[model samples]
Target: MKPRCLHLEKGPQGFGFLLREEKGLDGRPGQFLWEVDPGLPAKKAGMQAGDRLVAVAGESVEGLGHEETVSRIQGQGSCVSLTVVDPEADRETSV
Candidate 1:
């Protein structure tokens, strides 16, 4: 799936989402949205758990560490804009 833009405002409990980094089959670290709380800003902003985070504040997150990525997101103040891509799991798993 193509990358989609998301604009989210911080809630009382932060963005109400969890971010995780894991090594893919290619041995490359990827940032993923691990969990999105229901009725929260992240869920309201159209974020999905399986989506991979591509950019923070319009800057590409490629090669960035998980901590760096979190910092970038946190530095964006109460409002943040992100670009994410769906994992397209079906196509990748089809063999």
Candidate 2:
């Protein structure tokens, strides 16, 4: 999928995407954060703070959160699909 810009917010436990609502992420636990800065390498890859990942590798991520979701999103060159719900636009989009 093509990468795009997203919005994110820091939750009490970890980082969260605005599209994810209160639940946070939808991948395996402890996944979802990515490094995109030129100086600092991204701790994770293929994802950003605001990108609400809804699927990993081919699995669905409808109701998972935090560590559960993070686990799925993190891996070696694993491609993930996200059901991004844009908070600003209040619309659902698949990426």
Task: Give the best candidate by TM-score.
Answer: 1
Question: In angstroms, how far off is 72's CA in candidate 1?
Answer: 0.4
Which residue pairs show collisions in model 1?
none
Tens-digit per-residue lDDT, 28-71, candidate 2: 33223332332222213223444445555456655666556566
- Tell me the tens digit of each residue's lDDT in model 1 across 13-74: 88988999987788778899988899999999989878899999999997677999999999
Q: Relative to the true structure, how large is the alpha-carbon lDDT of every model?
A: 0.89, 0.40
Report how far residue 51 has shifted in candidate 2, in Å. 4.5
- Candidate 1 C-alpha error for residue 57, in Å: 0.3
The residue-level lDDT of candidate 1 at 37 comes to 92
TM-score of model 2 (CA atoms): 0.35
Measured with C-alpha atoms, the lDDT of residue 39 in candidate 2 is: 24
